[PDB]
RNA sequence: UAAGGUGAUAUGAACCGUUAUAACCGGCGAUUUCCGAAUGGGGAAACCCAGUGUGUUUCGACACACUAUCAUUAACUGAAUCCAUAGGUUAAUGAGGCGAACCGGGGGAACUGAAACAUCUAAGUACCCCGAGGAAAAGAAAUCAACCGAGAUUCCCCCAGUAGCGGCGAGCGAACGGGGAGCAGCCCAGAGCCUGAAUCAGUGUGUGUGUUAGUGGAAGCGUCUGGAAAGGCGCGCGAUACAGGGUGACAGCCCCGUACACAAAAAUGCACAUGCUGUGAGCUCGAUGAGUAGGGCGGGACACGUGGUAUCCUGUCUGAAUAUGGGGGGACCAUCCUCCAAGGCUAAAUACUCCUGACUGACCGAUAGUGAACCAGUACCGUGAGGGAAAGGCGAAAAGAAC
RNA sequence: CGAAGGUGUGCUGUGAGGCAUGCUGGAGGUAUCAGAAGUGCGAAUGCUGACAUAAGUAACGAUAAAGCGGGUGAAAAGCCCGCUCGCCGGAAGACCAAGGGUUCCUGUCCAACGUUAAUCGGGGCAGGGUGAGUCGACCCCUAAGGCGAGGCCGAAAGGCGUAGUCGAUGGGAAACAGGUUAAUAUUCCUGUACUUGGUGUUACUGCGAAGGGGGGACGGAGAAGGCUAUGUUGGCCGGGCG
């Protein structure tokens, strides 16, 4: 499913509102990308399905902390 | 009858069990033949078999 | 004339049988409905 | 804890047999009791080929309610009410009037 | 089959039909009511242990029960298994 | 507990018992075929077909046990690929399914109203889906108030159909404050002195109380009518008991009960007292939650439909201070007041009743009341989902009509 | 010593009504003044049950067809037995699969069911009847398709799919004649056969798969030729001389 493994962002339902204020249901999808992160603690490439915001979170925190959170949450990566 | 049967061992209770099974078979043959008359002996032997099996399961170790 | 019901026990058991109902979630709901209503016969089986 | 046992002498309180003294024969579980020569009914017994073939009008006893009979005293000579008590270590029945063990 | 406890349970009753009588008179066969799950080897061992007679072969068939009426109620009698045990020469019961 | 019983239709046969293993009742046990989450593999449910390990054997074959998937921990094992990793086997623990309502969350209509209709309503309703508990959720102020103060959440009554929102139409609709039910506060982001001085939680013991069987439990006769008395008449008695139900008509004193006084070998709940393991009080120092608050864009929830619109959530793009700081006080600014987000936990008052027991009804009384007073979710209808009836009353007693 | 309810009669008020009493019924009813309503039916092509009319009317379901004798029986057009007659005969005959489930055979009964009667019946009741190494299923193999550990995908539900596992309508071993019951038979009996595995003994020997190669293994149409099932005729045998 379209879920960011770092942040948990899912598709979220909302409205397309016309100029006549016609409300038709729609989905906002996240900006998911499958990325191979070079983990140094294991000398490996770990593939994760991550949003761009999650990638910024990885850049800030460090991949080690993010993976620690993921494995504390479960999330077989 | 259970008070008397508790004296017996695992062997000599299996022998009793098998003897009641033989008697049950013989009563079944007479009954089915239509020449039993004493129809209540079938209830008696069946319950005796149940008693012997209960005492076997008690003395098994549980 | 050729009428609608043309019986076949294999087709009956694959269509409305117990295992056909247990295969899907909706069939399990059908069985739950019938078991709550109190049906003597829960499926076409037997 | 039943006030009338199998072979008590009883006296009929109500019904066509009122005042008649008899000896009870059976105590049915439906609260009815058979007493010797009390509630006589003439049954029209049909004959049958195999067993008890002689038919006829047979006068036998029907069951009356246990509440319709009272234990007969025979010391006072009257109908009486029954109560319970413990003597030595058993539940005995005692005549309400003249407080004596049956 | 080997267990005498099983042997004492497989056989149930003898059949008392005209076909059974003719089979006994001609083919040296005894007809028995037996259990639903009794196998041919079980019937053979049971007859040849309990009745103490040598057995040539056993044929079996399952009899379907009848849908009988009692008042407004529909009952269905229980199915039963019928065994044709052909003895070799000797018969006692 | 017991002098009677072996459930009913439902008679009969054969029996069992009668001072205590007949029966019946309650506690604790054993047995518990097959299908069914079904779990050794398969399958058109209740069937078909196996493997491994022990133990028997007349050498025919038998009996018992284990053998599913996934998740977590460990141990061995281990590629491309050197170390490694994925992976493989094994072992322990756990889960799977069902269930009426209440509960939280993820999705989410239309009919309809607006006398048409699109913003709006209906309505975050119906319905689908995920998840937990006996309750759930929320909960200890980056909250309100107003220069006076209050002090966590939850629920009821007002405030008030008010202020507001609104093709300012239809309609929607607060809060501040006040009165009540209940009332409880804590912990981590970390060190020292004091270390297990609070404190719950799992798991033993003693005493009182409760549930699962049960004991005793008062007192009425005569006469008339009548098929039959419990009715009438007369005269008596009990009542901490005149609730109710049976008995041949309407019974306080015939029966079963009721008031009331008692009872447990065994299991178990509730309180105290009272254990084992393990969780760790108090003072002092500190620290005190960043891709976060905030912002652009697009939506949504707030009574509030973007309007002059504060506050709250976030799909996308960005992005601080960090106690000399930051959030809020309904555009926005200044002063003042107030609180301290970006970590968690927490009983009561609250909600519902598949089921269990007691009691009640100006509730129905067989076309009513549940669809079903009765062998009803049945007969019958349909491929199926599904739909779905009719049908009570002899009599006090079968004495149910010998001949 | 007779309640409610039913059915008559008499009286009574302006009316909805009220009162009394005969018969039936066989056990409840209830003043007065207040209180509450599932409180009043002639219609809604109203709902449910009963009962009429049409009316003893139409119809009695292929126009293949019936007649007579005897028997049983309370009763015979219909059942049984017999003789004649007529119909089908690439079917209206025999046998399977599917579907059904006891309708099968015997004894008994005729209320209802049978478009009439019914002694009869696929009707009611009772008892009996379905016998396999070789037939079929199961089983071993797979087709279309289904399901599907990991896996990919998807708000949840869930979708797809790999290894694999199911899935016949197809491939895979083997039995034929005769006799026999009221009802089964390639199953029972008689006779004569065939198949596939286990284990022993014996003689010889290189055996081994989740692998390799062959076979299984395949279309439409057409023509013959050789045969057989089968039929006809002749011979032979048995009976006949109408």
From Swiss-Prot, chain A:
This is Large ribosomal subunit protein bL28. It holds the Pfam family Ribosomal_L28. Keywords: Ribonucleoprotein, Ribosomal protein, RNA-binding, rRNA-binding. GO terms for biological process: cytoplasmic translation; ribosomal large subunit assembly. One of its GO terms (cellular component) is cytosol. Belongs to the bacterial ribosomal protein bL28 family. Part of the 50S ribosomal subunit. The keyword Calcium does not apply. Disulfide bonds: none annotated. It comes from the Bacteria. GO terms for molecular function: rRNA binding; structural constituent of ribosome. SUPFAM superfamilies: L28p-like.
UniProtKB/Swiss-Prot annotation, chain B:
InterPro entries: Ribosomal_protein_uL29, Ribosomal_uL29, Ribosomal_uL29_CS, Ribosomal_uL29_sf. One of its GO terms (biological process) is cytoplasmic translation. Keywords: Ribonucleoprotein, Ribosomal protein, RNA-binding, rRNA-binding. Pfam families: Ribosomal_L29. Disruption phenotype: Cells missing both S17 and L29 grow very slowly and have a rather unstable temperature-sensitive phenotype. One of its GO terms (molecular function) is structural constituent of ribosome. One of its GO terms (cellular component) is cytosolic large ribosomal subunit. Binds 23S rRNA. It is not essential for growth. PANTHER family: 60S RIBOSOMAL PROTEIN L35/50S RIBOSOMAL PROTEIN L29, LARGE RIBOSOMAL SUBUNIT PROTEIN UL29C. Part of the 50s ribosomal subunit. Contacts protein L23, trigger factor and protein nascent chains. Might also contact SecE and probably does contact SecG when the SecYEG translocation complex is docked with the ribosome. HAMAP family: Ribosomal_uL29. Belongs to the universal ribosomal protein uL29 family. This is Large ribosomal subunit protein uL29. It comes from Escherichia coli (strain K12). The lineage of its organism: Bacteria, Pseudomonadati, Pseudomonadota, Gammaproteobacteria, Enterobacterales.
From Swiss-Prot, chain C:
The keyword Ribonucleoprotein applies. Gene3D superfamilies: 1.10.287.3980. GO terms for cellular component: cytoplasm; cytosolic large ribosomal subunit. InterPro entries: Ribosomal_bL34, Ribosomal_bL34_CS. GO terms for molecular function: structural constituent of ribosome. Coiled coil: none annotated. Keywords: Ribonucleoprotein, Ribosomal protein. One of its GO terms (biological process) is cytoplasmic translation. PROSITE patterns: RIBOSOMAL_L34. NCBIfam families: rpmH_bact. Belongs to the bacterial ribosomal protein bL34 family. Part of the 50S ribosomal subunit. This is Large ribosomal subunit protein bL34. The lineage of its organism: Bacteria, Pseudomonadati, Pseudomonadota, Gammaproteobacteria, Enterobacterales.
UniProtKB/Swiss-Prot annotation, chain E:
One of its GO terms (molecular function) is structural constituent of ribosome. Part of the 50S ribosomal subunit. Contacts protein L29 and trigger factor. Might also contact SecE and probably does contact SecG and SecY when the SecYEG translocation complex is docked with the ribosome. It holds the Pfam family Ribosomal_L23. GO terms for cellular component: cytoplasm; cytosolic large ribosomal subunit. The keyword rRNA-binding applies. Belongs to the universal ribosomal protein uL23 family. One of the early assembly proteins, it binds 23S rRNA; is essential for growth. One of the proteins that surround the polypeptide exit tunnel on the outside of the subunit. Acts as the docking site for trigger factor for Ffh binding to the ribosome (SRP54) and to nascent polypeptide chains. The lineage of its organism: Bacteria, Pseudomonadati, Pseudomonadota, Gammaproteobacteria, Enterobacterales. One of its GO terms (biological process) is ribosomal large subunit assembly. Keywords: Ribonucleoprotein, Ribosomal protein, RNA-binding, rRNA-binding. This is Large ribosomal subunit protein uL23.
